[PDB]
Amino acid sequence: XXNXXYX
Amino acid sequence: XXNXXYX
How many residues are given for chain A?
7
Q: How many A×B Cβ pairs under 8 Å? A: 7
CB contact under 8 A, A4 and B3: no
CB contact under 8 A, B4 and A3: no
Residue B3 to chain A, least CA–CA distance (Å): 7
Asked if residue A7 lies in contact with residue B5, where contact means CB atoms within 8 angstroms, the answer is: no
**Which experimental method was this entry solved with?**
X-ray
Nearest alpha carbon to residue A3 among B3, B2, B6, B1: B6
Asked if residue A3 lies in contact with residue B6, where contact means CB atoms within 8 angstroms, the answer is: yes
CB contact under 8 A, A6 and B6: no
Resolution of this deposited model, Å: 1.0
